[PDB]
């Protein structure tokens, strides 16, 4: 599964923590133009897969953004790191204790996010508890007035290490589908730094694939979101010729 025979007894470390399914909780507070709303995620996750089910609620009411634009801040320690790159698993490697991950999103033409979260084991749970804080939007906008697509499209993203800080840093471009067939960019700015003073794994640069499936629950009457997400990583050869010349 296994995740534990690695020469390197720091990467059986984290391994060890993400064998098998774990489970998953996402809360968050938002304030994007002065509505507050929260929300609160249960699932699991299975590394050996990059694979996240998650189901989120809106447990304030309507949610005053559209769900797709969350996403991206609603636990990539669940990323599928090939074996020849988990030297470079600096999500697993910050774990029990965890780390901070920071983003601003910037909507062009309209608002941004910015987004503060901590993402670390409370026992056998992993936690990602979250604030989030919009300005500048448009109240009759793309965001405010709910004028995206309930979809999400595929993309890589590009991980480097912020070797100053003992952490990473990435910024990529999420475009969501507006309801007229145009798109929505919301460009991220991230960072991500451990919490505890203990020693982690800085990668090489490499990417992130990711793809995501939204649904609903007919069962459901809260505001809400099924999610199903696969993130594997890439960008890193082997070696040595390959092994396949």
Same mark, same amino acid.
């Given at each position: 599964?296994?995740?534990?025979?690695?020469? $390197?007894?720091?990467?059986?470390?984290? @391994?060890? =923590? +993400? !064998?098998?399914?774990?489970?998953?909780?996402? @809360?968050?507070?938002? *304030?994007?133009?002065?509505?507050?709303?929260?929300?609160?995620?249960?699932?699991?996750?299975?590394? !050996?897969?990059?694979?996240?089910? =998650?189901?989120?609620?809106?447990? !304030?009411?309507?949610?005053?953004?559209?769900?797709?634009?969350?996403?991206?801040?609603?636990?990539?320690? +669940?990323?599928?790191?090939?074996?020849?790159?988990?030297?470079?698993?600096?999500?697993?490697?910050?774990?029990?204790?965890?780390?901070?991950?920071? #983003?601003?999103?910037?909507?062009? $033409?309209?608002? /941004? &996010?910015?987004?503060?979260? @901590?993402?670390?084991?409370?026992?056998?749970?992993?936690? /990602?508890?979250?604030?989030?804080?919009?300005? $500048?939007?448009? %109240?009759?906008?793309?965001?405010?007035?709910?004028?995206?697509? &309930? /979809?999400?499209?595929?993309?890589?993203? &590009?991980?480097?290490?912020?070797?100053?800080?003992?952490?990473?840093?990435?910024?990529?471009?999420? #475009?969501? /589908?507006?309801?007229?067939?145009?798109?929505?960019?919301?460009?991220?700015?991230?960072?991500?730094?451990?919490?505890?003073?203990?020693?982690?794994?800085?990668? *090489?640069?490499?990417?992130?694939?990711?793809?995501?499936?939204?649904?609903?629950?007919?069962? @459901?009457? #809260?505001?809400?979101?099924?999610?199903? %997400? +696969?993130? !594997?990583?890439?960008?890193?050869?082997?070696?040595?010729? %390959?092994?396949?010349?």
């Amino acid at each position: 599964h296994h995740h534990h025979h690695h020469t $390197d007894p720091m990467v059986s470390k984290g @391994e060890e =923590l +993400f !064998t098998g399914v774990v489970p998953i909780l996402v @809360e968050l507070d938002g *304030d994007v133009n002065g509505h507050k709303f929260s929300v609160s995620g249960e699932g699991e996750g299975d590394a !050996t897969y990059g694979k996240l089910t =998650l189901k989120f609620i809106c447990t !304030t009411g309507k949610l005053p953004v559209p769900w797709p634009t969350l996403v991206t801040t609603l636990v990539l320690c +669940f990323s599928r790191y090939p074996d020849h790159m988990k030297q470079h698993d600096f999500f697993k490697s910050a774990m029990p204790e965890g780390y901070v991950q920071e #983003r601003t999103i910037f909507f062009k $033409d309209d608002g /941004n &996010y910015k987004t503060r979260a @901590e993402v670390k084991f409370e026992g056998d749970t992993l936690v /990602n508890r979250i604030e989030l804080k919009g300005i $500048d939007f448009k %109240e009759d906008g793309n965001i405010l007035g709910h004028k995206l697509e &309930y /979809n999400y499209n595929s993309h890589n993203v &590009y991980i480097m290490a912020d070797k100053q800080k003992n952490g990473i840093k990435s910024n990529f471009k999420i #475009r969501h /589908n507006i309801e007229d067939g145009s798109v929505q960019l919301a460009d991220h700015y991230q960072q991500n730094t451990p919490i505890g003073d203990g020693p982690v794994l800085l990668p *090489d640069n490499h990417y992130l694939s990711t793809q995501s499936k939204l649904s609903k629950d007919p069962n @459901e009457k #809260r505001d809400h979101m099924v999610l199903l %997400e +696969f993130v !594997t990583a890439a960008g890193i050869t082997l070696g040595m010729d %390959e092994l396949y010349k």
